[PDB]
Specification:
Strand order of the largest sheet: 1-2-3-4-5
Structural class: alpha+beta
Distance between the termini: 22 Å
Entry title: Structural basis of the improved sweetness and stability of the single-chain sweet-tasting protein monellin (MNEI)
Helix content: 10-25%
PDB class: plant protein
Assembly: monomeric
Largest sheet: 5 strands, antiparallel
Keywords: monellin, plant protein
Shape: globular
Name: Monellin chain B,Monellin chain A
Radius of gyration: 14 Å
């Protein structure tokens, strides 16, 4: 239920979401999105009683902002197309 995904536009836009969310919290001041780097991890979350009904996803991203590397965890739900920043912290050293 985990897989590595690539770092094209959809993944970069997760990173921009994470930075936009992190900026709202302001723990690290105002950050400027740079890029998501590898590796990017995607977890598929299933409904408990479906067969293979996908509820949504959780992503673990390494994202540079304002030249600092952060670890961001995002959840994403079909149904509501809602994204939540679960966690944003750092700076971390590069993986």
């Amino acid at each position: 239920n985990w897989e590595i995904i690539d770092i094209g536009p959809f993944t970069q836009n997760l990173g921009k979401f994470a930075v936009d969310e992190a900026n709202k919290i302001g723990q690290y001041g105002r950050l400027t999105f740079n890029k998501v780097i590898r590796p990017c991890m995607k977890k598929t979350i299933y409904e408990n009683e479906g067969f293979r009904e996908i509820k949504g996803y959780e992503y673990q991203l390494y994202v540079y902002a304002s030249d600092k590397l952060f670890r961001a965890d995002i959840s994403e739900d079909y149904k509501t197309r809602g994204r939540k920043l679960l966690r944003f912290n750092g700076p971390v050293p590069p993986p």
